[PDB]
Amino acid sequence: VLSEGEWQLVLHVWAKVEADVAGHGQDILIRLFKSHPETLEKFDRFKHLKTEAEMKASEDLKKHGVTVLTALGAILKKKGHHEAELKPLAQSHATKHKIPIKYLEFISEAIIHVLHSRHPGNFGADAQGAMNKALELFRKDIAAKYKELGY
Ligand code: HEM
């Protein structure tokens, strides 16, 4: 369970992210795809992209980065009381998109890296640890839903 202090650190940096949702979403998905190419293969929508420049030039990829970070932001602002937001996401990601929990770990790493690059003064080690805990909570709770469903 995150403390109130930990949530403050998470949401303080997240308020910075929200000044440029789409740029962050692009950097995070690109980092995910470059670092873990099996992830790109899960997107029929993106698997034609073969270079980082092609990824950066895709408006559809940028739109999807906004979709992703908008959903994550709504979850983080619930400070753990996020059951209603996570159910539909876990259901789609387990049963329709067929995303393993491990790939959620990979996107969490990409998020943390991009936040560190873009917001170092609001993303020192205390805030990195708190965000790690927030994303771990996200993963834990999705994984319990996956287990229920047999994924
Ligand atoms: C922070 C983690 C993530 C969040 C918040 C997130 C959120 C979303 C949202 C809101 C959608 C659209 C609604 C829905 O289908 O549920 C979506 C679609 C999708 N997500 Fe994620 N997602 C995450 C991680 C991932 C990862 C790691 C993968 C793949 C490796 C993935 C693959 C997909 C796919 C394939 C779709 C459908 C895209 C399309 O063809 O339009 N998601 N995601």
Swiss-Prot record:
This is Myoglobin. Nitrite binds at H64. Belongs to the globin family. The modification Phosphoserine is found at S3. The modification Phosphothreonine is found at T67. It is an enzyme of class 1 (oxidoreductase). Pfam families: Globin (PF00042). Monomeric heme protein which primary function is to store oxygen and facilitate its diffusion within muscle tissues. Reversibly binds oxygen through a pentacoordinated heme iron and enables its timely and efficient release as needed during periods of heightened demand. Depending on the oxidative conditions of tissues and cells, and in addition to its ability to bind oxygen, it also has a nitrite reductase activity whereby it regulates the production of bioactive nitric oxide. Keywords: Cytoplasm, Heme, Iron, Metal-binding, Muscle protein, Oxidoreductase, Oxygen transport, Phosphoprotein, Transport. The gene is MB. One of its GO terms (cellular component) is sarcoplasm. It catalyses: Fe(III)-heme b-[protein] + nitric oxide + H2O = Fe(II)-heme b-[protein] + nitrite + 2 H(+); H2O2 + AH2 = A + 2 H2O. One of its GO terms (biological process) is removal of superoxide radicals.
